[PDB]
């Protein structure tokens, strides 16, 4: 039990470290915002 608990805690800590270090991990979630913003921008630009 102690080893399993230690492994789980270490894995959670590594999860936090990886999330903090890697800024591109959440790219799949920034993609939707970028797509919506680009669609709005091209819609606005079409007025010209």
């Amino acid at each position: 039990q102690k080893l399993i608990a230690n492994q789980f805690n270490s894995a959670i800590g590594k999860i936090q470290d990886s999330l903090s270090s890697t800024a591109s991990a959440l790219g799949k979630l920034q993609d939707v915002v970028n797509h919506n913003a680009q669609a709005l921008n091209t819609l606005v630009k079409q007025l010209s």
Partner: protein
């Protein structure tokens, strides 16, 4: 995993005609294009929630 988008609302007259009253009068002759547009946007908006 993404779960929802940004809920967008588009006002026809402001976009197509802006402040032009004559354009707004002319736009009425094209029918219910804007009704369909706003209905679809509203459907997407409720779908996100």
């Amino acid at each position: 995993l993404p779960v929802s988008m940004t809920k967008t609302s588009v006002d026809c007259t402001m976009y197509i005609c802006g402040d032009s009253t004559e354009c707004s009068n002319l736009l009425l002759q094209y029918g219910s294009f804007c009704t369909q547009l706003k209905r679809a946007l509203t459907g997407i908006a409720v779908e996100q929630d």
